[model samples]
Target chain A: DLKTAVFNAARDGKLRLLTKLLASKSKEEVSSLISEKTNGATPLLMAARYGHLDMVEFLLEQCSASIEVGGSVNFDGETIEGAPPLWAASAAGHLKVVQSLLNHGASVNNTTLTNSTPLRAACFDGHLEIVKYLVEHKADLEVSNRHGHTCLMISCYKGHKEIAQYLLEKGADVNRKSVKGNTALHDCAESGSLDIMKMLLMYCAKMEKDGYGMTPLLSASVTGHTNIVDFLTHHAQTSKTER
Target chain B: DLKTAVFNAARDGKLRLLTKLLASKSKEEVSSLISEKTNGATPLLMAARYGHLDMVEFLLEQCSASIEVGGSVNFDGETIEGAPPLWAASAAGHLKVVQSLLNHGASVNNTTLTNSTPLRAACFDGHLEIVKYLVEHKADLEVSNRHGHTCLMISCYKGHKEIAQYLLEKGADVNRKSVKGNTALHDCAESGSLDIMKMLLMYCAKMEKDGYGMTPLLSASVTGHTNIVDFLTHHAQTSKTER
Candidate 1:
């Protein structure tokens, strides 16, 4: 009952009620409850998922909630298993909650069961500020998820130019290959992000073939991304001539 | 100005403003505006997507909006191209909006770019009421999308026994195969929906092999659905003896 109450309070952002409940319990009892998983989610995970910044801070600072007790939570009726509190916050674009979790000693590079790190979650959702914060917190730029997609690869695929550029600037491997052998350039081409393709090319993203043996230019051509194809072709020609 | 105003009004559910705008425009102008796409969505599509049932009726009855003017719409930031008002309403589970659209002559079997028909959309989302309504209107029960997955296939995969049963009763093919040559029974086995699997088996879903040369029983076995495997194996044995 106490676990359910605390979980609901965190999920609903009932900071006052949560404080009262936490105050009534001994430190050991409170810690036990703080780490208790209700429906595969801890109170910290619930707070982060709903962007309850105050509740996240209270649990971490006062209740000594384990910042790394990660698990799954149901998001919009879909069970996202093996996601930690930081992953939940980042996926939800809860910038402040992500910041609080990181500051309170949450593992910046903690991965889910699927090998999806917090930084990858932010990039996948195009959370620019959160991606920046995670990068600032020394999050691994090249760590791939279970899908073998790096943060830059996902940002390119999702057409998040700002996040892609930030990751690239932070030395994200522009040529990181996904399980499908897709480079960030390949993803950008498929997604029709001409601008991102240009950025990747500028960073010298090799025109390597994907698992399908198609170059980024070919990938863009097949997907009818005329602008990206044209840009890649022209850029490739210019580089050849300069060489 | 009138077109943009009406489009915004419809998108935001501003019925009073939309009414006034409609009144100011000539019949031809209003008709043109009704079909004009703003951000890739017509007024009817917008109203239906947001579940503005009153606005949907007004557009159809008062403005003489074309119920079948199919176009793309930006839903949750993704471009869902080639969706009619009926598809939008059905996908959103707006039963009243779907009813109004159908009453005004919207196609019950309208599809999107992915060839996802209204019935498929309803079944995929597990909206039993909408699925029932679409079937009653004679929506194609065996229509497969680009992925070659029929309504029954998706319902079984999503574990919506009621919808799957309804489709089966309405003459849906139990052995319909996807592009991958996976049948509805294969999907049921993969999803571990023993109930739906039993229903399909009763409807005479073939124990035929898939593209991967696996029967429904083998599929269940590989997916580790022991209950399903036992059930299918026993059922297969009975069928062989009957044959």
Candidate 2:
């Protein structure tokens, strides 16, 4: 009952109830409670997941929770296994919680079970500032996940123009391909992000074909993105004229 | 060279070229050439894939090509493995070719490498006439793909209202959950088909939760289908009142 109550309290950010529950418990009980997991998450991880900054800090400083513990979290009702508190914060856009965790010794380069880092998590959700912070703390811009998808490719696929631009300026591989052999150029065109496509082209990204023998132009056409098609068409014409 | 020429001829519906190519060969040569594959497709299979009724008939009648041959076909840069003649015809919306295949003794219930039947392929691309003909020819309406998605689920996901209604009227199960534990209601809500959702509801499709603890209502919220959420909300209110 105590573990279940604290899990609910931390998940819902009920600080008063959590404090009251902690106040009556012995040191050993509090230690066991803080260390115990509910659905693969400690109270600290749950608080970080829900963006409860006060709850997160209290659990960290007072309860002495481990910041490095990775747990499962929900995204769009899908379970993301083995995610750290920093990853959950970045994924959910809990900027303050992310800062606190990182400051309190959460590993900046820590990765999830899928090999995705906090930086990639932030990039997935368009958390620009968190992405910047992670990079500033030496996040590997070129590290790919289990699918061989780098930060630049996902930013392009998600249509995060600023994030893609930032990743490109940081010297990300403009031509890096995924496990399926699709490049950042293919992703940008598939998502109809002309702004990011232009940014990639400036970094010398190629109009490469995927494993399916399809160029980015064909990818755009298949998705019915007329703007991407028109631009790629004219771009093709320009290339031919120059040749 | 002969195999390449015939494949090109059948793919482009060049019946004259195909006939000419067969003219220069002996009976044994003709048989070998027609039966031989270019990219895993017999000449007859290629003809059927491109919806060439004349080419398909010519190959079957004059060349005595086998009708049960399955082969690879490309769709939107992805190769569909092991698709039979009727499956290709139905998927490509070629009604005449489908009729020809059925007349030539093509299997109505032939499956792809992915376990998707010709009927399922037709439903996927909204080929209502092909669906009708396939069902009339004894296609299995209840056959699901490898992912456990039935005709009703795919039709709902692809926004093919008429095809979904047809499947439901033909006794397709309304509450069949996929391997991912999502039912037809989840598919309709995810694809923003309020009409299809209503049709399933009339068949007593319950708003049950998926394995991820997500209902059709939560599925709609994830996809931002406001119209679906609105209808399901009022539906919930009515359900509660009746209780």
Candidate 3:
């Protein structure tokens, strides 16, 4: 199928071949094939996912291909959408690609049928700078994916302290507990990020005792984060002494 | 002072003496003396705090002594050590004492100096039966203390498998993340409790990645929880195939 050839060329980053193929076909003919799906992926979607930004740009500009074309409906009637080109780029920390997509009017807040967005993708992939770029472009930090994880929660859970700090500084609620009542401090403690733990405490984000009346100190102790335990205990003791 | 007399009698379970003193002392006299530092204890508060059922019963019988006595300081500035009374009994799984305190008007939901209620204390201390009892008695199962942790988080962090299971069965949010985004699953994974991790997953807890984007599987791999890693990968693959 022409769809297969186009999708394969885009996925393989054969930008020159893709451009030649598009030139050889009528724009309407290419557009119809662009809408044709393979494995729930369109040529543009395949190109985006495979990091062929040039092919994606060419497809959009020349073929009038849909930028949001890779998602397919499943049996549950839920559509499984691949990440948008911006999301793929941000997730891969391809700042230039992200910038290019954004400049081309890619929706920063575009939620995939699977509910993944550029911000969420960036945070999940630990691309701190990409995350920052998305945030700067007014990405919705509070939006959660189907997995119910927000950008802040993802960053904190992933031990991306600097990204998390940037997020908090940008007015993210530090005390925003997830559906299960976990905060950023819980993330750092669980991950044994001592520096992030200190940063969280400094931000007054809360490290109080939880359901077990256990503080970060207690969590660290029970989980065998000896250094974390010591650090939290030291902070607790210091706080107590100050009071 | 009248407060001192009641405190002394309550300390020794001198019910008759406490009753007489309660009948004689005015509410103001009782209040003033309780707040007055005498080895730092008010009659009802101290007795209830330490699991002294007989003494607590005696003090509550007093018309003047408050059930919610305000001023009782321990060496640790705990307001009362082994408190709140219900928490102490819950932590100890002293069922009879727990009942007595509850029946005699002890605040089951009262937070101690560390902001932990009896229910949370029981989980923290690994008192499975006590935790169960508290849950049955309608204790606030979802209450997070100052540290943004829930009872489930504590149980998992401490590797209290039974208590964690009980809490999870009782509708505790096993995936509840703390302030730093650490979930109960994160604690279980980091604690290397392969069995507990499985139990958590069975109970609808996520085998999610933490703040540093480390999946429980990744955590298991990095930490050398070979069996856990194997189980998670198998589960992930099986689920993927099913999908």
Candidate 4:
């Protein structure tokens, strides 16, 4: 009966009613109903997936909802696909919701079915302010998803110069290799993003050689990046190999 | 003249009196004579390294007088132990000359100035057949030369499967880690040698957790060796997550 009531209240986003029921009993009584499955759904998981920010926050704050828990019915076996309130809020570009969840101890490194953390969701979707908040909160600068693509790589690959610059300032490892061993420099070179390339170089990012020993210059040459080639040649003469 | 004489004699192990006289010709006569280097090794160095065999054969068949060549000079870096004729042969696992040199009163597994004995040098180079011959003829297997690595580590690290299998069967500790925490499995995994991994596994190889909290499974997983991970998982069914 409590499961049905909590589920109905959470599904309707009726935070006041849910809080009144929860507050009527000890916190332990509230937590037991938090994970009650109805049609294979837990109240906390339902609140999170539906982007019910207040409900999700209340469940986590009151129930100690596990950050890394998996639910059987969630997409791809992960209870939240970037389901943390930060990802949801960033996707909707709800800056206030994003800040509230982050302050309540949501991890910036949390990933979802879409292979995005909060920072990745914001940066890739061009939510500039949300990206800034997540980065300033010290979100991992070099963390990539399963595809070996980082926020900086994704933004630079799409030629989003401003977002790429913001990420670089936050200290992304520019030479970080993708799953295929290509670097962000490789992404920039391939996309012909000369401005981003120069900015990365200015930040002292080394042009990385991939697994096949193909450097950015070689990638540039293969892709017919003439300006990148010229810039690389000049830089190459001054580059010293690290021991 | 001496260089030319040594070069010609060393080239074919020729000890003819005329060739010796020509080689031993005065510096004035041989001033224009130039001896060629093959793969950075002069003919004299080759003769000293391989010449002993041919010279011994030549001395028995021909009427040429034997000219002893000093082993001090190494024109090629490949010369074993940096020693003259006898040690080079011994290090190369040239059993006949090693025995001949020993019968000719050469030291058995003598530590050269470089601190490498014939047995250690042979083992280090993965010459297991030579190791067997040397051991059968009384060369010590457990002798630690200047380098603390044993013949077993050399065979395993070098991926000499048969040699390593033989050494393992002969009671070399399958779990012995090098001073750097590199076990034979570490070498095999790093080499991406599936066969050697299987061989080590077959020997009841102790795949202990390395300093990286990596059992062979984790090492294979981190390196993305799916097949290795699969094989290790199949073999280590119950211990998959033991580490």
Best by DockQ: 3
Q: Write the per-residue lDDT of candidate 3 for residues A31-138, one digit (tens) a residue.
A: 887677777766666566556667767777765447644453232333445555666666656776787677777889887665778887777657888888888898
* Steric clash pairs (candidate 2): none
What's the DockQ of model 2?
Answer: 0.01
The per-model lDDT (C-alpha) reads 0.80, 0.83, 0.67, 0.59
TM-score per prediction, in order, is 0.49, 0.52, 0.49, 0.43
Task: Spell out the clash pairs found in candidate 1.
Answer: none
Writing each residue's lDDT as its tens digit, candidate 1 over A1-243 gives 878998899889999988888886788888888888888878888898899988888888755556777777664556777788899899888998998887788899898887888898888768999988888888888889776867887788778888878877888777667675768887777668878878887787866765445577766665557898778778778857764
Per-residue lDDT over A15-93 for candidate 2, one digit per residue giving the tens place of the 0 to 100 score: 9999898887887887788878988888888898999998888788755546888898999999998898898999999
Error of 2 at B226 (Å): 2.5
TM-score of chain B of 3: 0.74
Classified by CAPRI criteria, candidate 2 counts as: incorrect
- Going through the candidates in order, their DockQ values are 0.01, 0.01, 0.02, 0.01
Q: Which stretch of 10 consecutive residues in model 4 chain B shows the poorest summed lDDT? A: B61-70
Off by over 4 Å in 3: A63-65, A70-82, A208-218, A233-243, B1-243
Clash totals in order: 0, 0, 34, 5
In angstroms, give how far residue A107 of model 3 lies from its true place.
1.1
- Superposed by TM-score, candidate 3 places the C-alpha of residue A214 at a distance from the truth, in angstroms, of 7.7
Compared with the true structure, the alpha-carbon lDDT of candidate 2 equals: 0.83
